[PDB]
Design a protein around this ligand. Structure first.
Ligand SMILES: [Cl-]
Ligand SMILES: [Cl-]
Lengths: 382, 382
């Protein structure tokens, strides 16, 4: 039960390893923004700017500045992204691009709303960290675009996706200081009700990625799809929100679901959770289904640490230890820093990178910070 | 040098194994069209109708009826698809859907032109096999939509894809009997010139998937991408077209390129060709890059058999044998019929299916038929 050693492990990994890696290798001080396409050793292999990741990195450094320590270098790193993004990130109608060239010329315009999501979250927390009022309105613009486009984010077979209420819930938390208290309260209750009613299958105790509007299943590739890590991440989002109202019943239901997903999705031959599974045991359409991904395992560490902190349930601690041994031994790279993102089913490195189009300065530092928080809270009552 | 035994191997695999599998398990005689989502044993795991594959299956049975033997059952199988597709396959503007429900209700409308491509090819050959004149105009409609939309199939970084002239070349061959002789001649010469000028890198002797309009490379994920099997398939397309004009120089250049790609893309640890590679040795964005796919290896068998038949070059025969031993021992399923589509890098079955959203009655029977043709021609001068 060495909670204090775990707290120290996560604190040291965040401050001395992971943040250091991004500080040393990712800053584009000449043109603004960040290089995310970094190989195992931190070498740059592509200079394109993927806006999700640009915004996530602004958020991470702004958050840590605001909540942990006002280190000048963290704020300067956040500014290097925020200024670049404010100048180049949006089309004439204020919609966020998906990708730019190094110098900020637009490459890709997205159909989704997740670009706007990450922009709202980043500029909200940058506004707070930097005391930059202009960033508040950038954030508010991006946020109303998400709620406006929520119901069709992009007749025969109506379906809706878990990702939409998920990101809108967690985002609303990040927008709290800028929103009417009632608006916050309502969206939070509604998104939580939708996630726990429609996407949670009461009979199987599992989260589905896509359901009909009334929560019923549809027998098709989309309607059979399970993404173990995605559902686990949603559940700690739900825990975090339920904790605010001390809704212990909802916290415990979320923990039930996390344990169900882990028991369902663990690879008994090689260890780790599968990336995708078909709920009915049919062959998935995803060629990457059996792969072992960094964030799937990190968000599981967060959910189990948070579940144990919030409920004290022994099963969370037992699963925490099992997940810890697997994730730390397979993804963490002690020699060069940071975590590998992509392993094959056997746990072998599949892409020799620390960042890319979809991995940047976000899931790893956020998860390490959150786990540090849970174990520190466990060791030291507030 | 047992050419006759190879001819017999391919003939028997096509007629007694592969066509039999699709005849036994894939026909939707109640509603029309075909079930492609078939597991290892032929069991159906999804009833959706993926229009690419519906059209490809109409083409395969129509082609064999027209070129091999007028078996009544083959034409009835082709009709079961063609009638279903004519009734349900197109929107009000005559554009082909990407997917329908079992009964033909539209699910997905595609942005690309490859749906129209496969529809033009299918209805062209169905028109010929069935003597159905109405199918000619369905085909001609679909074909002019492809040429009309060829230049933007769906300012900062202009790029074009190999798939477009590739499919337009091979398609033009399948439309020959319906087109002005001059129109055929021109498109064929132009598509061949574009493929062999712009997408073929003269210095590396390799095919690139995406280049700038003038054929120059762009240093980005798309511009570094190699798809070994895709380039090999394009090269036998080029061989087939060059053979028509007895353009021996072009035939031999295409064979040069096939041999270059095989030497570049062969997995020296586990055997087989990689699905995707980054030309500059950076980490790919494709999580499926190291996988071993049925059509990648089948189109390589076709290209090597055809290359050897057309040129007699010993290297083609040596690579044929190497590829044959790998592909037949890893993909062919003697117990239940047909070929697995999807193996991991080690050659282990990754998806336990014989068909799905992207694998249907096309690459396997076409490749087995073409290889039968090459070895029969080698054994028996015409
Ligand atoms: Cl990330
Ligand atoms: Cl196919």
């Amino acid at each position: 039960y060495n909670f204090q050693a775990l707290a120290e492990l996560y604190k040291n990994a965040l401050l001395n390893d992971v943040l250091s890696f991004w500080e040393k290798y990712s800053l584009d001080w000449q043109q603004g923004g960040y290089f995310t396409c970094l190989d195992r050793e931190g070498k740059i292999y592509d200079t394109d700017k993927f806006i999700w990741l640009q915004n996530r990195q602004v958020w991470t450094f702004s958050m840590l500045y605001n909540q942990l320590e006002k280190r000048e270098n963290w704020l300067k790193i956040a500014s290097n992204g925020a200024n670049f993004l404010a100048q180049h990130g949006r089309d004439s109608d204020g919609n966020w691009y998906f990708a730019l060239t190094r110098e900020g010329k637009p490459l890709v315009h997205p159909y989704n709303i997740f670009s706007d999501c990450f922009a709202a979250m980043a500029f909200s927390k940058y506004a707070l960290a930097g005391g930059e009022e202009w960033a508040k309105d950038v954030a508010m613009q991006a946020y109303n675009n998400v709620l406006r486009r929520k119901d069709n984010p992009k007749g025969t077979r109506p379906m809706k996706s878990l990702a939409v209420p998920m990101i809108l819930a967690n985002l609303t938390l990040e927008m709290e200081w800028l929103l009417p208290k009632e608006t916050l309260e309502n969206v939070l209750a509604e998104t939580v009700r939708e996630v726990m009613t429609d996407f949670l299958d009461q009979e199987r105790g599992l989260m589905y990625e896509n359901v009909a509007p009334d929560g019923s299943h549809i027998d098709c590739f989309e309607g059979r799809l399970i993404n173990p890590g995605h559902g686990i991440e949603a559940m700690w989002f739900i825990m975090d929100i339920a904790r605010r109202q001390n809704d212990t019943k909802t916290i415990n239901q979320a923990v039930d679901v996390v344990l169900n997903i882990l028991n369902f999705a663990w690879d008994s031959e090689y260890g780790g959770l599968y990336y995708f599974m078909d709920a009915d045991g049919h062959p998935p359409q995803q060629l990457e289904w059996d792969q072992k991904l960094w964030w799937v395992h990190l968000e599981s560490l967060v959910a189990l640490a948070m579940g144990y902190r919030l409920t004290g349930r022994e099963a969370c601690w037992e699963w925490y230890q099992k997940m810890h041994d697997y994730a730390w031994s397979h993804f963490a790279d002690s020699e060069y820093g940071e975590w590998f993102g992509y392993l094959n089913r056997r746990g072998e490195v599949l892409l020799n990178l620390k960042g890319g189009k979809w991995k940047g300065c976000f899931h790893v530092p956020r998860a390490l910070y959150l786990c540090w928080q849970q174990f520190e809270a466990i060791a030291t009552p507030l």
